[PDB]
Design a protein around this ligand. Sequence first.
Ligand SMILES: [Cl-]
Ligand SMILES: [Zn+2]
Lengths: 174, 597
Amino acid sequence: CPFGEVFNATKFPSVYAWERKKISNCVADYSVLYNSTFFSTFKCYGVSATKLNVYADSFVVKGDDVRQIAPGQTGVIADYNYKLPDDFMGCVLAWNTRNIDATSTGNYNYKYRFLRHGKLRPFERDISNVPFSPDGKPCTPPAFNCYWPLNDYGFYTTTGIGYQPYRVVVLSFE
Amino acid sequence: STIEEQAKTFLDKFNHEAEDLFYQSSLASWNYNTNITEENVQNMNNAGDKWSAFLKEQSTLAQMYPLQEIQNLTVKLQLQALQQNGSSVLSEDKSKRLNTILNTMSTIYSTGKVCNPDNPQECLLLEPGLNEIMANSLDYNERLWAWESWRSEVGKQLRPLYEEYVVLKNEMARANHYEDYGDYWRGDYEVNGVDGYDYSRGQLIEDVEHTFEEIKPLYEHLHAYVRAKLMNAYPSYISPIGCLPAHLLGDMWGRFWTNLYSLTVPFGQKPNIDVTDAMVDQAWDAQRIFKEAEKFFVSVGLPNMTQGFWENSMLTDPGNVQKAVCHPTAWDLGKGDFRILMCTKVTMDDFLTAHHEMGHIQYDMAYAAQPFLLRNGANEGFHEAVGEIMSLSAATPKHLKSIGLLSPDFQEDNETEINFLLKQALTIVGTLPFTYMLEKWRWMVFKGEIPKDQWMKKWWEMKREIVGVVEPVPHDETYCDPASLFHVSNDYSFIRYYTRTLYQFQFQEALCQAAKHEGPLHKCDISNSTEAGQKLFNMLRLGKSEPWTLALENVVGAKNMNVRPLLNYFEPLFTWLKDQNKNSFVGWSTDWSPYAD
Ligand SMILES: [Cl-]
Ligand SMILES: [Zn+2]
């Protein structure tokens, strides 16, 4: 029922600081979104129908980055911002948001993490912004080996689909 | 941790930071080259210098990681590239000074115009005007005048600067552990580690000179031929066993004998291989042209142009109101952004050009998955060569038929083919000795082998020996003819034009064999041949990533540069030339002159 608040929602979060919405009680049909060539991805993982019965994560990534919101999957996004378990699952949906989330001049709100000691455990999250030394030392940019771990996407409207902004919704099942 | 793993974690911040900061400069550059404003041209300088700044920062930052203690090649390559002192290794004076010399040369070359003694009120510059004379005028004097003026006015002005230039540049070069500035340039072709595929800054000169020999027979014969063809045009002005007067070779420097076609055509009675007529008749437009080029690549197993290519590119001139600079170019902006800027006219020439430039694009895409610093043709020669194969396949009468541009029932006279080939030779083969000689002299200047006071002596000594041309007027050190030519007086390695030119044959050949082509090598069109595409794409997807020697292997199955393919492409012409030269003399006296009367 409250899916209007997630998709169709104005403001979207960066991948590193992704949102979880809890939905129990409320029952919906799923046919709300079942029928739309607005969605570019929509790969499901272990299901597809309606038995009438739930977690919904959302965030924005680059076009090529969508690959990585599937069980297994390479890294950076899956290593460092958002990991899906190999086990459990529901579905993963994406749509192109060039018009919204990108500008002629270039849009830079949307961020991601590319430096981290360790990999995320599925559904884990890291909102730390601590200058990164590949040894655990303290820091002071750009002290030869000190970098900030967060990178700006920088979505312009005239980039390859690979580099255009995409919104994502992951529906975990419980 | 380890300096390796900790270098990986530098390049990674570098790529994904450079990529964006570069896309800044491209988007700017692009705005300008298309909506030429004062507003725009200034932006083109902001991110433009912010780039140079970002670079110098990261260059000196990258120095921090010791070249020595590394082993993941890919990383060593990237680091090497980035740690490029260049200007830094100098003083503060002896660096801005160099910089000074450069820009002045650039501008004086671009801004130099010469004055008509027979009418002082009209005075044009190289392009057009002078270039126009050299290309068209059939008047000995008119020609001799342009040629001389140029090398005399702007030639001399550049002499002092060029003298100063060679020092600071060598000073620079030697400081970075190079034998000379030449040794710096040859640098481009170097490869270390990677056994079986190595190459040194000596192996080049060795290989260029070795290759250049086998051309001679062919060259001397083309030479011999045009010579006699020229005598006819300029009767009494030419010796039947002498060099060719430098001012009668169709352009200012004689770099290409293209324009001599009108005078040297084997069979002037045969007509157009030109569908400019037939294209405009079937009401083709810009779109159709590129949409065709698109089809051509897809045909061999390559991808459609990107949606972004169609909706972002500029395939047509907007005329006035929005004035744009129209030199045809492919753009690899980064961020999956690929564009052509081409002010298209519905002409065969343009139709071909579109196949060339869209070739660069296809290369640019191929190597896009490579990290930023490795996105780039294997060597300075690779990108232009790929470009050129495309026009090779597209220009075949076969391809032109199978497309509805060439009227169905047109046959090929062995005479139309000899025509076309001669055409090619005037350009492809004329420019070769010219090229190799040019950069030999440059090389030798940098190896400190030509004394200041014997600069022009040695220039023309070699134009006579190597190229078979002579000066209409004698030239002391007051002049400086080598710098009369863009590439030289604008600090650009010219040898690329030699190697590319070879590759581009080794390539087209390999590809026809693989496309299974049956006729003369020059009748070859690789269309519809997916099997051949695969083999090309094999080197394409590499970028600067593997050594160029390996890169070459993937395509032609060999580890080095080979000229045989080029000579093959000129077999039916070469034999026919030996025939026409029956009674002609083949070779030249270095001793004869146009002058001294
Ligand atoms: Cl010259
Ligand atoms: Zn080109």
